[PDB]
From Swiss-Prot, chains A, B:
Gene field: IPP1
Chief location category: cytoplasm
Note: Present with 68400 molecules/cell in log phase SD medium.
Cross-referenced InterPro entries: Pyrophosphatase, Pyrophosphatase_sf
Residues where diphosphate binds: R78
Protein name: Inorganic pyrophosphatase
Active site, per annotation: Y89
Protein residues bound to Mg(2+) 1: D115, D120, D152
Keywords: Cytoplasm, Hydrolase, Isopeptide bond, Magnesium, Metal-binding, Phosphoprotein, Ubl conjugation
Family: Belongs to the PPase family.
Binding site for Mg(2+) 2: D120
Crosslinked residue numbers (Glycyl lysine isopeptide (Lys-Gly) (interchain with G-Cter in ubiquitin)): K238, K278
Protein source organism: Saccharomyces cerevisiae (strain ATCC 204508 / S288c) (Baker's yeast)
Modified residues (Phosphoserine): S265
Amino acid sequence: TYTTRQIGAKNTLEYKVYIEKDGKPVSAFHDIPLYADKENNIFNMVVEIPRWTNAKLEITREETLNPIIQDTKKGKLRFVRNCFPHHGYIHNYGAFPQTWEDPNVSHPETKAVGDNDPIDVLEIGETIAYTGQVKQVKALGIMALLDEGETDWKVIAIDINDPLAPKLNDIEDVEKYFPGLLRATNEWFRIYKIPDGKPENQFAFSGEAKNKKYALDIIKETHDSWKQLIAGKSSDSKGIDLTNVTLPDTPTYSKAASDAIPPASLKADAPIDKSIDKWFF
Amino acid sequence: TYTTRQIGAKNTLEYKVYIEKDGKPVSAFHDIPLYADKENNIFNMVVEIPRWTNAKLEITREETLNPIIQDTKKGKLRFVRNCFPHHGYIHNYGAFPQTWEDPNVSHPETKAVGDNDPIDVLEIGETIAYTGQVKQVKALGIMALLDEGETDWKVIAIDINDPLAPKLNDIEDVEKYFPGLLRATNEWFRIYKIPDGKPENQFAFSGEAKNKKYALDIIKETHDSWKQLIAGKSSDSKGIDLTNVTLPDTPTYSKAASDAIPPASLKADAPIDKSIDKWFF
Ligand SMILES: [Mg+2]
Ligand SMILES: [Mg+2]
């Protein structure tokens, strides 16, 4: 829940970022609490992709302790392209740990199976985050994205330490203080894959940002799917590595899975190919 | 017209970049030829600010060999803030060398004088340029901002090496291949001071980007102004250091000025304050 272990250089096939709790790698999927404060609904967010970057960095579902590694496409690193007027991702992009978009069941809101990942979070605060960061966020609302035909909810969140956090308590506050951001988000996740030769995505509810209560309800849903999956009780865990070092009541618990992770070998960020500069229109 | 030499660490009051021709520093204002190909109107552009950065960099007209440094006001380094939905600068921002906007001369359709600087160039191509880079661009059109009694033209240009450059020749082609970029340009120059406590800027021709010929006329005007300037014939070259190392009959020729320039610095970029992350709405 605590620090970062970087293997290799950023923008490179060798790159991994493990999350450390007390110097030791924990599973970024399973081993980080959903709640930093269940009492006040403060969540733990795992940051994957800083605002205004392109490299498609993910918690890897099939790698032990699920380090963040860059996605690849036929072997080549994957970057999201710049879709005018936007530069890379327009949110600090991450996941709530201990949640799962159930791929095996059709979700009633969207009429589709889940995308088989943690539930995604758009943290809208002013400071750009870093990969591997665990931060504390509160939920403002939620958008029902169908990303390539899979239920792919996007939680709208704000860092608890953001200057604006006190003023932001529900989704109406985001339009109030961040005018046009939600419209832009609706647009961004519709179009961000056209440059890749893929179709426009879709939203349920015409892309309406559902409120905090609705967000809490859906996060709850994805948490319970995760509790089944991590219990070994999913109909299909879809090849996910459920090795964890904090949850002893689960079949795949192993404290020294941590020990077998290589030590940090941070190198300077490799250069990104110049083509990733291009602004698509 | 060749390489760069950086003195200082980037994002620092000490920071300066020089253009080198074959290892040796020349004036970025005076020694880079305006035309890379006159008869075809291919100009050499001096790039000051990469697209999607914040630091307000500029050729100094008052320093010898006129290095690119960061603007300051009352001792504080100057950055442009992030104005939604824009991230920093939305063009590669540069100037044409061997041009100058005579403050002692006035336009009538744009009732306003020179701002005493080289003409500003917005290069609209896909690759993000580097500070001090000299690229070959073609002019497509020109907008006229009206900063207090002085006409601030902005040539709209594209890199000659850009994949799209053959398809682009006049201002309507920007509307064709870069839909929305013109209105963004228009919006950005209008608001980009509002976060700095300033008013909204103000366009001539009701924000109309006039065409290639209109740009060629202006550009060629400001070269003729520079010509009388460098020849020592100018009415008022207050504050302009006209030192140059390639024009051997000018009053201000001095090869030794190249020789005087410190070696390139071995300092990593200074950190930028996280307040610059902020997205302003
Ligand atoms: Mg997802
Ligand atoms: Mg100017």
